Amino acid sequence: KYQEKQRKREAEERRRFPLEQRLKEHIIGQESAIATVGAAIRRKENGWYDEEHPLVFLFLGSSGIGKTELAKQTAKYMHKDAKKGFIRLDMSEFQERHEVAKFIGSPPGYVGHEEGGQLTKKLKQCPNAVVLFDQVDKAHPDVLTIMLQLFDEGRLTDGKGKTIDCKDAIFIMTSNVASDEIAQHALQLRQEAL
Amino acid sequence: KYQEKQRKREAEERRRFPLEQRLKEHIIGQESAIATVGAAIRRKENGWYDEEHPLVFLFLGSSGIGKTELAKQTAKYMHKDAKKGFIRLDMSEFQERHEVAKFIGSPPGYVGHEEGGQLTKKLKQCPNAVVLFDQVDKAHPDVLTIMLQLFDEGRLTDGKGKTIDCKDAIFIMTSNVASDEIAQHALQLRQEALEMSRNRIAETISKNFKENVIRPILKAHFRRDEFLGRINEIVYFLPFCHSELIQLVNKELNFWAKRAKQRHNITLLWDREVADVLVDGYNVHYGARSIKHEVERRVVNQLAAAYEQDLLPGGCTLRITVEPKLRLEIIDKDSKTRRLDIRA
Amino acid sequence: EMSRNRIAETISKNFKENVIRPILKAHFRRDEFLGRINEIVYFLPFCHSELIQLVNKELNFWAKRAKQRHNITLLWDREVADVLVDGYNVHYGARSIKHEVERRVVNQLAAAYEQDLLPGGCTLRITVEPKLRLEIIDKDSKTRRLDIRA
Numbered sequence: 001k002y003q004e005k006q007r008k009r010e011a012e013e014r015r016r017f018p019l020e021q022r023l024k025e026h027i028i029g030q031e032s033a034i035a036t037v038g039a040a041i042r043r044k045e046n047g048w049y050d051e052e053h054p055l056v057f058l059f060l061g062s063s064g065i066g067k068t069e070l071a072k073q074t075a076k077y078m079h080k081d082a083k084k085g086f087i088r089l090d091m092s093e094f095q096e097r098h099e100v101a102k103f104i105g106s107p108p109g110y111v112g113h114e115e116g117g118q119l120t121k122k123l124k125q126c127p128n129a130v131v132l133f134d135q136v137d138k139a140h141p142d143v144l145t146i147m148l149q150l151f152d153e154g155r156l157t158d159g160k161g162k163t164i165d166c167k168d169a170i171f172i173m174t175s176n177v178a179s180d181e182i183a184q185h186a187l188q189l190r191q192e193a194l
Numbered sequence: 195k196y197q198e199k200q201r202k203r204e205a206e207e208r209r210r211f212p213l214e215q216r217l218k219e220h221i222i223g224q225e226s227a228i229a230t231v232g233a234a235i236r237r238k239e240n241g242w243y244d245e246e247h248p249l250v251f252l253f254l255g256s257s258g259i260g261k262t263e264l265a266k267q268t269a270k271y272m273h274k275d276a277k278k279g280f281i282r283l284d285m286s287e288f289q290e291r292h293e294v295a296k297f298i299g300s301p302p303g304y305v306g307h308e309e310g311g312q313l314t315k316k317l318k319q320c321p322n323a324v325v326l327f328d329q330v331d332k333a334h335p336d337v338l339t340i341m342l343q344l345f346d347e348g349r350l351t352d353g354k355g356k357t358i359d360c361k362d363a364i365f366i367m368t369s370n371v372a373s374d375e376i377a378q379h380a381l382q383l384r385q386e387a388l389e390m391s392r393n394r395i396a397e398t399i400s401k402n403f404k405e406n407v408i409r410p411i412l413k414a415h416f417r418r419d420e421f422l423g424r425i426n427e428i429v430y431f432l433p434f435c436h437s438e439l440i441q442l443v444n445k446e447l448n449f450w451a452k453r454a455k456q457r458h459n460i461t462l463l464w465d466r467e468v469a470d471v472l473v474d475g476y477n478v479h480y481g482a483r484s485i486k487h488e489v490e491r492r493v494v495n496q497l498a499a500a501y502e503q504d505l506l507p508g509g510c511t512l513r514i515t516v517e518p519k520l521r522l523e524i525i526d527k528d529s530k531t532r533r534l535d536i537r538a
Numbered sequence: 539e540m541s542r543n544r545i546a547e548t549i550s551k552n553f554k555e556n557v558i559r560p561i562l563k564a565h566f567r568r569d570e571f572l573g574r575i576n577e578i579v580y581f582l583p584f585c586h587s588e589l590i591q592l593v594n595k596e597l598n599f600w601a602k603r604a605k606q607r608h609n610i611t612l613l614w615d616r617e618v619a620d621v622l623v624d625g626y627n628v629h630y631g632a633r634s635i636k637h638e639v640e641r642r643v644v645n646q647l648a649a650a651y652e653q654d655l656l657p658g659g660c661t662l663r664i665t666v667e668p669k670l671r672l673e674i675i676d677k678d679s680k681t682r683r684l685d686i687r688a
């Protein structure tokens with residue numbers, strides 16, 4: 001009964017000042033994006049999410065219109081100022097195919113094997129973290145192939161064979177792909193609306 | 195006599211509810227794949243398998259059509275919830291030649307040598323495990339060269355020299371190689387079947403496609419004919435027909451109805467028109483995941499918004515209805531079916 | 539070609555030294571390593587007679603298992619081997635014949651054994667209907683195809 005009362009109090013607190021208003025304090029425009037991200041996170045926090053499959057976003061748009069800002073404020077909403085629950089990874093570092101060792105660490109018998117992976121350590125520290133694969137369109141596509149197991153099922157085995165359950169995470173992928181097409185279509189729709 | 199009686203009882207249990215029906219509970223469509231995998235595992239469990247060479251599958255097809263799901267349910271059939279007997283290995287981690295150390299440890303005089311290999315340890319723990327090399331094509335082909343010894347004879351010598359017998363294992367290899375070709379050929383065959391059906395009303399992947407189209411594509415990607423020769427059954431997962439899409443939407447809506455009834459006690463209901471509306475969100479490339487995401491967008495977000503607003507009390511009948519926008523409708527009597535005002 | 543022309547009326551050293559020797563030197567990268575090898579032995583693909591022999595070998599293996607374990611006298615015709623040769627692939631070799639025998643013949647045997655259509659001691663016969671079909675033979679020439687349900 002105490003846990004149910006605490007859950008009801010947390011639900012009332014979320015209903016008082018939800019993620020939509022909290023993003024509207026920091027984000028201007030992007031009402032469709034705030035609505036989509038808030039609806040998905042509302043589905044997650046209320047327990048209406050498939051626990052087997054983690055939540056995954058791909059923020060598309062032009063430059064400097066709040067993709068990384070909405071991802072950061074999403075991570076701040078879920079985990080407050082705790083730095084453990086915001087696993088930033090700027091994917092412009094991941095341009096070559098062989099940059100997956102940063103994700104998963106080195107195999108046995110190679111330099112950096114004892115240090116293990118970086119993302120797998122950060123997800124061991126916080127399984128439900130908001131991972132922000134920022135600038136995802138700058139990495140190799142073969143490097144993004146590692147995210148298949150991490151997105152469908154929330155698992156990523158390190159170099160030492162230790163798999164980490166990342167099912168409660170919220171993966172976000174900022175991208176400038178189709179930025180010109182989205183911008184031209186939005187300007188065309190706004191001119192037609194005018 | 196007791197062992198023979200237990201074997202006969204296990205055989206009667208398998209005949210009562212075989213792997214085909216147990217897969218058809220979860221998997222929808224893919225009757226060729228379920229038939230192939232079921233016939234192979236029936237050959238294995240009834241003792242009609244060569245004990246020297248392990249059984250090796252290659253699951254080919256488009257994205258999100260039950261390759262990894264059928265592999266997981268195959269492993270659950272063979273070993274129940276025992277995690278030892280399901281050695282998952284996401285092969286997208288193996289994108290470089292030097293990633294075979296995860297399989298076979300490290301040599302003497304190097305870091306990680308005492309820990310030994312990971313797959314060889316897991317196969318020492320369970321020799322007859324269902325090893326799922328998920329997304330095998332995303333690994334380096336030189337990394338797949340280690341699987342030759344492990345597929346032809348079931349052996350994988352670690353860094354410490356300790357060989358492990360893996361002959362009873364059921365290796366499964368999910369891959370999206372020739373996914374576009376399999377999808378286009380299946381859609382072409384369905385179009386030809388519909389053409390012949392309407393022509394008659396007016397009054398199966400062929401081996402040539404496997405040998406002429408898919409075999410060169412596999413030989414190009416895997417780069418080794420011996421690796422493809424070791425595979426016992428290259429299974430072909432086809433895209434979903436429209437009936438299979440309606441069945442997938444009904445499966446997802448039944449999943450959310452079960453969650454709503456168990457957790458929150460909300461008898462969630464819907465019409466056939468709801469499934470027909472949600473089928474329009476199906477993307478051929480993404481497969482069943484598009485239906486799951488469409489159900490999460492259209493249906494489940496409304497359920498979460500109504501639950502957060504305390505509009506779905508316990509014990510309420512909640513019918514989804516097409517207005518095409520889906521709209522919830524809490525029910526109290528026969529005529530009383532009020533729509534819920536889900537504020538922003 | 540020469541045989542049919544005459545009726546109408548081995549790897550050569552040059553191939554080893556010209557074709558195979560550069561490929562070996564390219565892969566192994568060391569003429570000393572190849573010079574230490576006493577005998578580079580060449581295994582050739584299977585002729586059609588050798589494919590029928592391989593199919594007979596695999597069917598004899600499954601016949602030995604059926605007789606030893608379950609006491610089932612498995613039998614087959616030359617047409618059965620001729621049908622199963624079509625599953626041969628030159629790229630995969632004898633493994634293709636093993637997989638074809640396991641697909642066509644032995645899945646049906648396992649389905650019949652699970653369904654108790656193969657008691658201890660029965661002259662079972664594979665037969666071309668081309669689909670292979672089992673035919674349990676009773677005493678005398680009485681035969682019947684097994685109704686292997688799904």
Ligand SMILES: Nc1ncnc2c1ncn2[C@@H]1O[C@H](COP(=O)(O)OP(=O)(O)OP(O)(O)=S)[C@@H](O)[C@H]1O
Binds near residue numbers: 061064065069174
């Ligand atoms: N809609 C917005 N409302 C308020 N501040 C914004 C908004 N969009 C961007 N900013 C500011 O822009 C700066 C960084 O912008 P980002 O958050 O990087 O946007 P973005 O779309 O990632 O594009 P990039 O350059 O292509 S990676 C921050 O200081 C934010 O304050």
Ligand SMILES: Nc1ncnc2c1ncn2[C@@H]1O[C@H](COP(=O)(O)OP(=O)(O)OP(O)(O)=S)[C@@H](O)[C@H]1O
Binds near residue numbers: 152221256445
């Ligand atoms: N035929 C199906 N019947 C029921 N559920 C399915 C089916 N196909 C896929 N799913 C669901 O889809 C989700 C994952 O699908 P997978 O098992 O990844 O399929 P897949 O074909 O491996 O493709 P990938 O993306 O290329 S690795 C799971 O939650 C399954 O429930």
Ligand SMILES: [Mg+2]
Binds near residue numbers: 067134135
């Ligand atoms: Mg950014």
Ligand SMILES: [Mg+2]
Binds near residue numbers: 261329368
């Ligand atoms: Mg998969």
